[PDB]
DNA sequence: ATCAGAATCCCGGTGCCGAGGCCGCTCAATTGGTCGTAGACAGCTCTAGCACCGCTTAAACGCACGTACGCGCTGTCCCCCGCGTTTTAACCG
């Protein structure tokens, strides 16, 4: 969320896809973006 | 709670066949030597086993609740035991 915080104040207009928490929030996220529209994905190690 | 009585322990006596000691008579155990070799010891390599933490999530844990079944109780009936009588096949020689 730090990296997203510099993705917040230090620049807008480029969206972010994070991955955190239980599988439900993810189901919302990659279920919405399943069609692959986004500027940037911000993820962490074991989620790849 | 108690005597009648049937089974059992206890004690004294007796007869016997197996336990225990002896004596030749081996033949395998002991000794003395060799001879080759399995493993004891030192050394080297490097693999998997040890500890630990980060991080996620399927499983365990605690709890509320219902009802399925374990268990106690009762009645029934049937079948296996205790005993007498009779027969036969085990036993012993």
Coordinates of C-alpha atoms (C1' of nucleotides) in Angstrom, one line a residue:
Chain A
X1 CA 0.0 0.0 0.0
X2 CA 3.0 2.3 0.3
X3 CA 3.9 1.8 -3.4
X4 CA 0.2 2.6 -4.1
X5 CA 0.5 5.7 -1.9
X6 CA 3.3 7.0 -4.1
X7 CA 1.0 5.8 -7.0
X8 CA -1.6 8.1 -5.3
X9 CA -0.1 11.5 -4.5
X10 CA 3.0 11.4 -6.7
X11 CA 0.9 10.8 -9.8
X12 CA -2.7 10.0 -10.9
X13 CA -4.1 8.6 -14.1
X14 CA -2.4 5.2 -13.9
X15 CA -4.6 2.6 -12.2
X16 CA -3.4 -0.3 -10.0
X17 CA -4.4 -3.9 -9.5
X18 CA -3.3 -5.1 -6.1
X19 CA -3.7 -8.6 -4.6
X20 CA -4.3 -8.9 -0.8
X21 CA -6.4 -10.8 1.7
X22 CA -8.8 -13.7 1.2
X23 CA -9.7 -15.1 -2.2
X24 CA -13.0 -13.2 -2.2
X25 CA -11.6 -9.7 -2.8
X26 CA -9.5 -11.2 -5.5
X27 CA -12.5 -12.9 -7.1
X28 CA -14.0 -9.4 -7.3
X29 CA -10.7 -8.0 -8.8
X30 CA -9.7 -10.5 -11.4
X31 CA -13.3 -11.3 -12.0
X32 CA -13.9 -7.7 -13.1
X33 CA -10.6 -7.3 -14.9
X34 CA -10.8 -10.8 -16.3
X35 CA -11.0 -9.2 -19.8
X36 CA -7.6 -7.7 -19.2
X37 CA -8.0 -3.9 -19.1
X38 CA -5.6 -1.9 -16.8
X39 CA -2.5 0.2 -16.9
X40 CA -0.5 -1.6 -14.2
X41 CA -0.6 -4.6 -11.9
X42 CA 1.0 -4.2 -8.5
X43 CA 1.4 -7.6 -7.0
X44 CA 3.7 -9.5 -4.6
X45 CA 5.8 -12.7 -4.6
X46 CA 3.7 -15.7 -3.8
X47 CA 0.7 -14.4 -5.8
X48 CA 2.4 -15.1 -9.0
Chain B
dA1 C1' -27.5 -66.4 60.6
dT2 C1' -27.1 -72.5 61.4
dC3 C1' -26.7 -78.0 61.1
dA4 C1' -26.6 -82.0 57.4
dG5 C1' -23.8 -83.6 54.5
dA6 C1' -20.8 -84.2 50.3
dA7 C1' -16.3 -83.0 48.7
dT8 C1' -11.5 -82.0 49.9
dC9 C1' -7.1 -81.6 52.7
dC10 C1' -4.1 -84.0 55.7
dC11 C1' -1.5 -87.8 57.5
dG12 C1' 0.5 -92.3 57.9
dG13 C1' 1.8 -96.3 55.3
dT14 C1' 3.6 -99.1 51.1
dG15 C1' 5.7 -100.4 46.6
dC16 C1' 8.2 -99.1 42.4
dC17 C1' 10.6 -97.4 38.2
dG18 C1' 13.0 -93.4 37.0
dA19 C1' 16.8 -90.0 39.0
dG20 C1' 21.6 -90.1 40.1
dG21 C1' 26.3 -91.7 40.3
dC22 C1' 30.3 -94.9 38.0
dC23 C1' 33.1 -96.7 34.4
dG24 C1' 35.4 -97.5 30.0
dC25 C1' 35.9 -95.3 25.3
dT26 C1' 36.2 -92.4 22.2
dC27 C1' 36.6 -88.0 19.0
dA28 C1' 35.9 -83.5 19.3
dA29 C1' 38.0 -79.6 22.0
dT30 C1' 42.6 -77.5 22.8
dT31 C1' 47.4 -76.0 21.3
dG32 C1' 50.7 -74.8 18.0
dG33 C1' 52.1 -73.1 14.1
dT34 C1' 51.3 -70.8 9.5
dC35 C1' 48.7 -67.6 5.5
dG36 C1' 45.6 -64.4 3.4
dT37 C1' 42.5 -60.9 4.1
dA38 C1' 38.3 -58.2 6.4
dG39 C1' 38.0 -54.4 8.6
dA40 C1' 40.1 -50.4 11.8
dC41 C1' 41.7 -46.1 11.2
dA42 C1' 42.7 -41.8 9.0
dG43 C1' 41.3 -38.7 5.3
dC44 C1' 38.5 -36.4 1.8
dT45 C1' 33.9 -34.9 -0.4
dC46 C1' 29.4 -32.8 -0.4
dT47 C1' 24.1 -33.9 0.6
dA48 C1' 20.7 -34.0 3.0
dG49 C1' 19.4 -32.9 7.5
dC50 C1' 18.9 -29.3 11.1
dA51 C1' 17.2 -24.7 12.7
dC52 C1' 14.4 -20.5 11.7
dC53 C1' 10.9 -17.1 9.6
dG54 C1' 7.1 -15.1 5.9
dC55 C1' 2.9 -15.8 4.3
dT56 C1' -1.6 -18.0 3.1
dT57 C1' -5.6 -20.9 4.1
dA58 C1' -7.6 -25.5 5.0
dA59 C1' -8.3 -27.6 9.1
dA60 C1' -9.1 -27.6 14.1
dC61 C1' -11.6 -25.7 18.1
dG62 C1' -15.2 -23.9 20.8
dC63 C1' -20.2 -23.9 21.1
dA64 C1' -25.3 -24.3 20.5
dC65 C1' -28.9 -27.9 19.8
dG66 C1' -31.4 -31.9 18.7
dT67 C1' -32.5 -36.8 18.9
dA68 C1' -30.3 -41.7 18.4
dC69 C1' -29.0 -44.9 21.0
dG70 C1' -26.8 -47.0 25.3
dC71 C1' -28.4 -48.9 29.4
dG72 C1' -31.3 -50.1 33.1
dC73 C1' -35.4 -52.6 34.2
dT74 C1' -39.0 -56.5 33.5
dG75 C1' -41.2 -60.5 31.8
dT76 C1' -41.0 -64.8 29.3
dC77 C1' -39.6 -69.3 27.9
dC78 C1' -36.3 -72.5 26.8
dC79 C1' -32.3 -75.0 27.2
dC80 C1' -28.4 -76.4 29.4
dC81 C1' -26.9 -78.2 33.9
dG82 C1' -26.9 -81.8 37.8
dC83 C1' -27.8 -86.5 38.7
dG84 C1' -29.1 -91.4 38.0
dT85 C1' -28.9 -95.5 35.1
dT86 C1' -27.1 -98.3 31.4
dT87 C1' -23.8 -99.5 27.8
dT88 C1' -19.3 -99.4 25.4
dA89 C1' -15.1 -98.6 23.9
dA90 C1' -10.7 -96.9 26.0
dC91 C1' -6.9 -99.1 28.4
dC92 C1' -3.4 -102.3 29.7
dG93 C1' -1.1 -106.2 29.5

